[PDB]
Every structure is written in C-alpha cells, then in structure tokens.
Design a protein around this ligand. Structure first.
Ligand SMILES: Cc1cc(/C=C/C#N)cc(C)c1Oc1nc(NC2CCN(Cc3ccc(S(N)(=O)=O)cc3)CC2)nc2ccsc12
Ligand SMILES: [Mg+2]
Lengths: 556, 412
C-alpha cells in the first residue's frame, strides 16, 4: 500500500448554547426499510458512515424515495434541524465569474472530483450530531443507528468545507504551474491552458498524480461536453460567449408573473444585448402581491417590448477579455431616466453591455443620472476586470466643467472623453450669481389656509406690476412655487425674483431638469425660456419691503 | 511579551461580518505581497471555513511615500469590541496639546506587531484579500498580534508604551506626548530647528526600545471659532441689504440681541435689487451694535465627552471648503476654512477626502476623538472613490447631505 496524506479536518461547533437535533424517526414501509439497510450497508463498507451504540441521544430522520423510471430507492437524511443548529461558515462560493472577465483558453478539460468529496473527513467531535436511525422490520428489534464520518450531502457545512479542502490541496499545484488556470464548480474541476494540447494533457495527469497524494481518484467527466459549456445561464464557446437563448413568449394575456419573468429574461439579456429597456414593462410592477393579476400593457409597454424583440431578433455575443488592450465604456441616454452602456476593447466587439435606471426621486437631472451610471459601471468593472475603464460620455467637456465647478456638492467622474452621440446631456438653465442691472425685480409670495386649502399666490415689482391669483386645494409650499411661476410667466427675458421660501430655494438650487411635480416642471420650462434669472432669498416677516407688501396681499 | 491580555466583544454581540468591497488588481497584488511577508513573520495566519467573520481591507499610500501599505477598516469590530477602560479608569485628554506651538505626529504602528493577540479573539480579526471576478476564492487571514487600526491595540500596548517613553518624558517636562490609535502626537513650544531634533531624539530613542522615518507637522495655536464678519461698504444696494439682513437673521440664532428692523426699514417700498440705498444713522447704529455683538464668544459653549462631535463641510468653490465642528446646533466648538488642496485642483472628491482627514486630525488633537461627518456629496460617489485618496490609518464615520443647505452663504 502507498501511504496517502490525510485531508486535514475542519473543526466544527454548534451555535452557542444550542444542542444537537432530537427529531423522531418516521415510520417507514417494510420495503423502504429493506432498501435503506442495503444502501447503508454499502456506505458503511466504504467508510462513509459507522454504526453506534444507544448512548448517542441525537437523531435526524431518514427517508426513502424513488424516481419515475429509475426503479431504485435512494436514501435521504433530512438535516434541516441540524442545519438550524450548526455554526455559520465562510461560504466562499457565492460569487461566480462573469464571462466578460475571463481570458480565452486554448484547451480546457474537466475532471470529476465526485469521489474526492467522500475522502474529506468530518470533524470527529461533531459526528455524534449526524446520527440517524433505520427503523427495524415490524419495530420488533432496536433500529440500526449510524453516524457520518464524511461530509453529509444536505448538511450546512458540507459545501464550504469541501471547497476549502480542495483549494488547500490544489494551492501548491496552481502556484507551481502558473501557466494554467483551475476553477472549481460542483464536483467538477476545470483546467484551462494556452500551451499546445500535448503539454496540456501532461499537466492534467500531473495534477492527477498530485491528487493521488491524498488518494483521490479523478477520471475525466463522463460524456465530455463539447463546447459550448452550459454553466450558470451562459454559453461559453472557445472564442465567444453569450447568454443561453433568450426567447420572449407571445401572449394575449400578461399577468403579474408573466410580466415579472419577462423582465428577468430582459435583465439577464441586458448584459450582452445592447439597448434593452425595462422601465415601462417594469412600471406595471409597482405594487401588487397577487401574481395572477392580469394587468393590461400600456402602449408604451407594448412599444418597448416590440422595441426589445427587434434587438433580440438575432443572437449576439461578447468577446473574452484581453488584458493587453485598453478597457473602454460608452454610455447612451435613452429617455425616462434609463441608460445603456457598452464595454469593449476594440470597436464593435463588446465585452458586455448593461443598463442603469434612475434612482427614485422627486426631482433629478441628466448630469446626476449620468454620474450615477458612471459610478455603477466603475464598480462593476473593478469587480469583473480589476480596473476602471476609460469612459466615452455624451456630454460636452465644457458642460461637465460648468456643472462641477458650480454644483454645491462634491462630484467627480474618472478619465473620460466626449462622444457626439445624440441625445447629448446638457444643462438647461443657469442662475445668475449677481442681480441683473436693468431687469425687473419681482417680489413673490404665496400663502394657503391649512384647513380650507384656499390660498393665494402673487408678485409685486419695482415698475408697479402686480398680480394676485386665488387658488383652491393648495398648500403653503404649492403657493410659494406658484408665485415664482407667475413671476417667470409675466417677466421679460431677464428677471430678478425675490422669495422668502426656503422650500422653493432648496428645490431650485438642486438644479432639477425634470420633476414628479408638474408645477416644478412648469417652472423648469419657464427657466429654459429665460436668458438671465437671479433668484434671491430673504427671511419672511422681517419687514423687507416688496416682500412685506406681497405677503399681506396673499395672506388672506 | 508572552502573556495574552484577555479581550472579548460586548454582551450579546457576534463578531463583524462586513463584506469586502472590490479592489483594483494593483491593490490586490500589493496586499498579496504585504500579507505573504506578514505571514512569514507570523503576524497573520491562514484561516479555514469555520471562521465566518470578516473585516474589509484595502491598500494605501501614506503622505509622500511610494510604498503600498495595507489598511484594515476595523470600524465595525471597534464598535463591537468591549469598551476599554484602557488599563485604567482612563487618561484625561491632554488639554495642553492643542495649545503648543507645533505638534509632530509619528506612525508608531509597527510597535503593535511585537505583542501577541489573545488566542480566542483572533478569529474576529478575519479579513479577505479579494479575487478579481471571483476567479479564485479570496485569501483568508486572521491576526496573531495586535493589528493596526483596532481599538484594543493602543489600550493593550499602553503599559509598554508608557514604559518606553518615560526616559524621554523624564528629560523633557515641557513636551506633551499624546497617543491616538497608531499615532503619537509630539507637541513642543520651541522653534522648528530644535523641534525636528527632539522628535528625531525621541525617534532615535524608540528604535533602541525595539519608526517609519515619517512625520506630519501641525500648529494648533490657530484653531479658533472663526468670527462672523459683516461687509463694510460705502454704498449699499437693495440686494446687499437683503443679504445682510438674511445673514444677521441667521446669526441671531447664535447671538442674543441681534437686531434687523432698522436695516429692514431701509427697504420700505418695492425697489429694484440694484438700486443704491443710503443707510440711516439708526441703521448704521444697529449695524454697529451688531458688529460689537459678533466679536464676543458665543454663550454657554462647552465640550461634553458623552456626546458625539459633528462636523459639517461646505464646498465653497475654487478649492475652498468651510467646516464647523459642534455637538448641538449653533454651539460651534470650532470653525475653519481650507484652500487650494495640494495636488487636487481638478478633483472635488480628492479635496473633500483631504479635508475630512485634516478635520479629523484637528479633532483628535483637541478632544481626543473623531467627529461624525456630514458630507456634501452623494453616497454612491463618495463610496466609489474615497479609498483612492485616504492616507490616515484611522477612519471616521460619515453621513450624506442631499439638500443644499441655505447657510453655505453665511460662511462665505
Ligand atoms: C476554466 C473554467 C471553466 C469554466 C466552465 C464551467 C462550466 N461548465 C468556468 C470557469 C470560470 C473557468 O475558469 C476560468 N476560465 C477562463 N477562461 C474561459 C475558459 C473557457 N473558455 C471557453 C472554452 C475554451 C476552450 C475550449 S476547447 N477548444 O478546449 O474545447 C472550450 C471552451 C472561455 C474562457 N479563464 C480563467 C482565468 C482564471 S480562472 C479562469
Ligand atoms: Mg409670506
């Protein structure tokens, strides 16, 4: 016998103060008992489980189940209770690579490490917690009691402990063979290389020879899958990648569930299919828990679905990543607060695509949304490629400079260049820094009655112009904005406006170009029409003339 | 030092489980080299899947240094670590450090690595060097020695530190030494030429007791509450007077007896904003009385060590940033202003990040703790970029201001 190294054991504990499981074994049918006895006898001979005495007080129920044509029984040990009481682990397989970050590999083999899983021992002091009982025939003898010596399938810690043990075993082989990559997923190990295929198979069984040190049999994966690889919803071809085929169903009647499973395919497809849009079909999703609700499509919802399928008409693929080339990201504004982007290294060969939807706010502007998109793509690219891409943005360099030098917040976007792809992000108005000589000065104010919702809005100017408009179903904040709107409506191209509304000044100083409020939107449309607007704030009720005068006019 | 000091978290609190944020390839590679050497020196060890805790890590370049350095975001673990009555009932914060002519800060962080960490607490210092694109599992480590950035490290080391320093302290009764986390603050009242000697004299004294050649030079004789000042003009437009009345109305929340009505009466009527208004003598008097009021300190302003310090920052344009440190509104404990941030005339976030670090340094020197920042920036922009310009071994807390404060004008 050739000595084999032991796979080092991971110590395992229960959750603090918690005890092991004590669940009653179900009664089974004589044919199920007979099947479980045979199954457990073979695993016992392979070392997987061991028989124990009656001192062990813990138990976990066993089951026997069948399949349709597979006319054999298979053991199921239900570790739900033990899992609730087992310590948390470092689950180190949550993230999975994105294909656009992978470099191409000339050759790839797959080894099955299924048999390897059972040579990983379970912590000795923990095995007592995995005990299970095979009930006896007619309940006339003591049930046969076993416990596990290896990581049980279905137990909380088995995936993390197994992958950790393989990784430690593989670490020196990977480090001393830097010309190959090794990736684990399931009971399968993927080995890629760029050397000629002869040197590849030698490195491969060099790895099997290495795995023999701990006595792990690893043949090739049965029925070797020719490319493409069907893995985590992708199709990995030797030189290109795409998602698995996206086919959008045809339906006369779309329900909540038929709607939310389409956006899933659309969201998944948006990583390679450029220009996918989701807002209008998404919108019908805003608030409903009954997933069978048949809600009709708006014809903006039909327009964008149709706009979709035209993009989904032909398959498109991404290229794999070349670290020697630059990484570039281009963004397009699409309207209604949504954006698409392409990341590529050479023109017309995208690594991947994507989209960004605006954050839910009461007011916003295109520059802030573009900035948010840039940060999201930045973070995604560091995840996928470990670097920030060079950006191509549909905003003029002069527009960005004006924006960040004057915006009240600190803001920044990394190295980028203008791309003249309409529509262009622009600033739509700019308030003056100083009062405008020769321009009419409008003192505005509004007020409303909290009980009757009756209000007034108006202005008085230095040239004696005046207006007061009575309003119904209004609030103080609404009349303050309406007062500013009237002044914009009734002034020439240049105007000084004096308000005491901290609420109105906070909105306008945020520089929105679109709003949930039609009143704010109407004010924005007025601001765009002007050539110069100076907006001044004074404190209310201090006897500031003009403001004192209009305050009395609008306050009842 | 063989013996472990026993440490544990607060009652009913698990260890930290903070997600590692993505890192660039060059920062990952820097961390791999740093941690490989730390592993060979025994300061850290590989951990297994039985440790589910995590604390974020990234890589830093300190002031005027080309060597990559690793920084651990121990903020969560510090919150959860037992409140340290650090070998004592506590040290009273040296109120004299903030009054000495010059203060030099020394990175004495390496001194921690020579004392071992309690074997049962090491699990809670777990961190992950991330992989790119999840292409391999992260590299998982835990500390065996006192790590830099941890609350317990200065506390546990205080006995040895006070011993190392006593010969130098016995010589110099006028040098005030203060320790905050990984940093020593050395403040004297003599001029620069002998000051660089006595820090090199203390520097050279340290190496004999078991470094980094580095330092930073401060001058806390400056740190006041900047007064509110009003314009002095020979001709006032309507707009000038409206702004003055606004500023005085704001100041009246801070100061008693500020009056506006004589200045308000200058604006009788509905006048053009650009029209010149002559000041009455009653308004000049009222403006003069307001000027006198604004030169006194504010009444009833005191530091309460039971409350958090709050720091607000306003972007003023052209590389200028104003800031106020307080514990309750309008009771400013300290105000200030920064200009032309070095090497960042084009990057708002770099400037803001340097301002945060300067303000935190001033707050350590004055009160011995860091303030809670209110940052004029969207969360997603700050979160993406601040680690790129961070150079201090501590990290404060922050929140985000999304509504433009009206009072940025008044600190202009
Ligand atoms: C090696 C590997 C395989 C898979 C498959 C799972 C399934 N199911 C997944 C990952 C994450 C892998 O991990 C890495 N994969 C790559 N590149 C890839 C390798 C595969 N090719 C496709 C391909 C190439 C050649 C042939 S061929 N001509 O041999 O038949 C067939 C298919 C696309 C890029 N790079 C790295 C770097 C570090 S890890 C890692
Ligand atoms: Mg009013």
């Amino acid at each position: 016998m050739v000595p084999i190294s032991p796979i080092e054991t991971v110590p395992v504990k229960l959750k603090p103060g918690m005890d092991g499981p004590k669940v009653k074994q179900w009664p089974l049918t004589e044919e199920k008992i007979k099947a479980l006895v045979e199954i457990c006898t073979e695993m016992e001979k392979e070392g997987k489980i061991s028989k124990i005495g009656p001192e062990n007080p813990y138990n976990t129920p066993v089951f026997a189940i069948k399949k349709k044509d597979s006319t054999k029984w298979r053991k199921l040990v239900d570790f739900r209770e033990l899992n609730k009481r087992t310590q948390d682990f470092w689950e180190v397989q949550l993230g999975i690579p994105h294909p656009a970050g992978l470099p191409k590999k000339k050759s790839v083999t797959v080894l099955d490490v299924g048999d390897a899983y059972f040579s990983v021992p379970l912590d000795e002091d923990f095995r007592k917690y995995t005990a299970f009982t095979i009930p006896s025939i007619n309940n006339e003898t003591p049930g046969i009691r076993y416990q596990y010596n290896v990581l049980p399938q279905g137990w909380k810690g088995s995936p993390a402990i197994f992958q950790s043990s393989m990784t430690k075993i593989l670490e020196p082989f990977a480090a001393q063979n830097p010309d190959i990559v090794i990736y684990q997923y399931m009971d399968d190990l993927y080995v890629g290389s760029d050397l000629e295929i002869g040197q590849h198979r030698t490195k491969i069984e060099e790895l099997r020879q290495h795995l023999l040190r701990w006595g792990l049999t690893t043949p090739d994966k049965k029925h070797q899958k020719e490319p493409p690889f069907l893995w985590m919803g992708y199709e990995l071809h030797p030189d290109k990648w795409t998602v698995q085929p996206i086919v959008l169903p045809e339906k006369d009647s779309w329900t909540v569930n038929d709607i939310q499973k389409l956006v899933g395919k659309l969201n998944w497809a948006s990583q390679i299919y450029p220009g996918i849009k989701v807002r209008q079909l998404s919108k019908l999703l805003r608030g409903t828990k009954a997933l069978t609700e048949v809600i009709p499509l708006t014809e903006e919802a039909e327009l964008e679905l149709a706009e979709n399928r035209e993009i989904l008409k032909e398959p498109v693929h991404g290229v794999y990543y070349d670290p020697s080339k630059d990484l570039i990201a281009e963004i397009q504004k699409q309207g209604q607060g949504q954006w698409t982007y392409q990341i590529y290294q050479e023109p017309f060969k995208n690594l991947k695509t994507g989209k960004y939807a605006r954050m839910r706010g009461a007011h916003t502007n295109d520059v802030k949304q573009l900035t948010e998109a840039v940060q999201k793509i930045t973070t995604e690219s560091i995840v996928i490629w470990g670097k920030t891409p060079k950006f191509k943005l549909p905003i003029q360099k002069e527009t960005w400079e004006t924006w960040w030098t004057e915006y009240w917040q600190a803001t920044w976007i990394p190295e980028w260049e203008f791309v003249n792809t309409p529509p262009l992000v622009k600033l739509w108005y700019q308030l003056e820094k100083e009062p405008i000589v020769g321009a009419e000065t409008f003192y505005v104010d509004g007020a409303a009655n909290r009980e009757t919702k009756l209000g007034k809005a108006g202005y008085v100017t230095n040239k004696g112009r005046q207006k007061v408009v009575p309003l119904t179903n209004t609030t103080n904040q609404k009349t303050e904005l309406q007062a500013i709107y009237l002044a914009l409506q009734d002034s020439g191209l240049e105007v000084n406006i004096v308000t005491d509304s901290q609420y109105a000044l906070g909105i306008i100083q945020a520089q929105p170009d679109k709003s949930e409020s039609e009143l704010v939107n109407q004010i924005i449309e007025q601001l765009i029409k002007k050539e110069k607007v100076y907006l001044a704030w004074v404190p209310a009720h201090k006897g500031i003339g003009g403001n004192e005068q209009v305050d009395k006019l609008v306050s009842a | 030092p063989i013996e472990t000091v026993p440490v544990k978290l607060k009652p009913g609190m698990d260890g930290p489980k903070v997600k590692q944020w993505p890192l660039t390839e060059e920062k990952i590679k820097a961390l791999v080299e740093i941690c490989t050497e730390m592993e060979k020196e025994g300061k850290i060890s590989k951990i297994g899947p039985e440790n589910p805790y995590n604390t974020p890590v990234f890589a830093i370049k300190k002031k005027d240094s080309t060597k990559w350095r690793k920084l651990v975001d121990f903020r969560e673990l510090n919150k959860r670590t037992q409140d340290f009555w650090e070998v004592q009932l506590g040290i009273p914060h040296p109120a004299g450090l903030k009054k000495k002519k010059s203060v030099t800060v020394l990175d004495v962080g390496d001194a921690y690595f020579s004392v071992p960490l309690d074997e049962d607490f090491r699990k809670y210092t777990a961190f992950t060097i991330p992989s790119i694109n999840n292409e391999t599992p992260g590299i998982r480590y835990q500390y065996n020695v006192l790590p830099q950035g941890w609350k317990g490290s200065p506390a546990i080391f205080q006995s040895s530190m006070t011993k190392i320093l006593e010969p130098f302290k016995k010589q110099n009764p006028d040098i005030v030494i203060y320790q905050y986390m990984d940093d020593l603050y050395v403040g004297s009242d003599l001029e620069i030429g002998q000051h660089r000697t006595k820090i090199e004299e203390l520097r050279q004294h340290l190496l004999r007791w078991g470094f980094l050649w580095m330092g930073y030079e401060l001058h806390p004789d400056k740190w006041t509450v900047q007064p509110i000042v009003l314009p002095e003009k020979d001709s006032w437009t309507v707009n000038d007077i409206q702004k003055l009345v606004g500023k005085l109305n704001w100041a009246s929340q801070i100061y008693p007896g500020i009056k506006v009505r004589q200045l308000s009466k200058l604006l009788r009527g509905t006048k053009a904003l650009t029209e010149v208004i002559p000041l009455t003598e009653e308004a000049e008097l009222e403006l003069a009385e307001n000027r006198e009021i604004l030169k006194e300190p504010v009444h009833g302003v005191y530091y309460d060590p039971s409350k958090d310090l709050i720091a607000e920052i306003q972007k003023q344009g052209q590389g200028q940033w104003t800031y106020q440190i307080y514990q309750e509104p309008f009771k400013n404990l300290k105000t200030g202003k920064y200009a032309r941030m070095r090497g960042a005339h084009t990057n708002d976030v770099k400037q803001l990040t340097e301002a945060v670090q300067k303000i935190t340094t001033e707050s350590i020197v004055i009160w011995g703790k860091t303030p809670k920042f209110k940052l004029p920036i969207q969360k997603e922009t700050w979160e993406t970029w601040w680690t790129e310009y961070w150079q201090a071994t501590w990290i404060p807390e922050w929140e985000f201001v999304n509504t433009p404060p009206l009072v940025k004008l008044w600190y202009q």
